[model samples]
Target: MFSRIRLATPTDVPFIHKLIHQMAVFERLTHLFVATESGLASTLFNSRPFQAVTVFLLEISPSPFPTPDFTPFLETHKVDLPIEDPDREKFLPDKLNDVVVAGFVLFFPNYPSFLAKQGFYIEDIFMREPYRRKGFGKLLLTAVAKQAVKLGVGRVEWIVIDWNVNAINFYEQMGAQVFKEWRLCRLTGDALQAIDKL
Candidate 1:
């Protein structure tokens, strides 16, 4: 298959959805794709202030059959975290959820230019099974890096499952330096609203 990487268009939403489902199945995760076609169409195609989806396509080459190293890729990144309860071991695969991959929600604020006072965050990055190890993921990151550089972003960041040494190595090989300085913090539900109120 001839491969190309470009910004995703509104017409590609269904394909994107299917890819997410395939990824979920491969990772053995329950499907949680709630967004509809119309929703994706509007968010990606419409002239909205917020950037909803930013995806790239990866057309495979030579054969549909993935390389042998692909198995190692999955094995290296398999996750088994318990659902919501830390004390119990659930053995769930560490897979990206559909809602997340489809949304392409960047956690950091989007600005025309970066400022010293503002910080940046990465929401997530996910690729379907067939696309893995074909340089599509790197192409995606490179696309984002260009955007970040254009915006004068101080840095671009993302998280990997702790056990996923392959991913960790991949990122490191791509010139991303791992930091151990900070722990993630969150405030959601009522607390999130309360913060605004205060």
Candidate 2:
């Protein structure tokens, strides 16, 4: 299949939101995702510096349908249905072709203070249900790395969910180190609000 990667625009928000929702389901974290297209628009298209996220979308011509393997996976992890409006459904295509978005990579800049250098911190890389196992995942990574090199960043980093052996093996095969010493820490909701009180 013919494929290419390009930066996502405001027009792409609905589909991008849908893809992330599907990803959250796959990760068993659907309960935590509350991103809406409106929120994404305000953030992803914001005017201020450091107020935007970069998103690369993979569009494939003659789009393929979800594979049999994905059928079983989805049976258990339900993807949220598309919005009811006919115009909305056009933005969320099913099997019809004409170069549909098959996946996306979202990332943003981060500073590694010890090195005094900036880097790319990948937030999400997701391929639609049928788009997996076709080497598209690595293509997305390569696209990100290419952008990093163009921007002369120090590194590209992301966290892998520990239990995803497939993802772990794939990343290792791509020559990425699985750092054993670093632990990710996060605070949210009440704790995040409490930080100001402290």
* TM-score leader: 2
- lDDT string for model 2 (108-170, tens) is 888888779888888998877666777677788888887777667888889997888888898
- Give the C-alpha lDDT of model 1: 0.48
TM-score of 1: 0.55
Please report the candidate that would top lDDT against the real structure.
2
Error of 2 at 118 (Å): 1.1
Clashing pairs in 2: none
> Which ranges in model 1 have alpha carbons more than 4 Å from their true place?
23-32, 45-53, 60-114, 117-122, 187-198
lDDT of each: 0.48, 0.72
lDDT of 1 by residue, 99-144 (tens): 1121122234443354553324555455654235645566556656
Looking at model 2, residue 1 earns an lDDT score of: 55
List where candidate 2 sits over 4 angstroms from the true fold.
Answer: 47-52, 63-97
TM-score of each: 0.55, 0.79
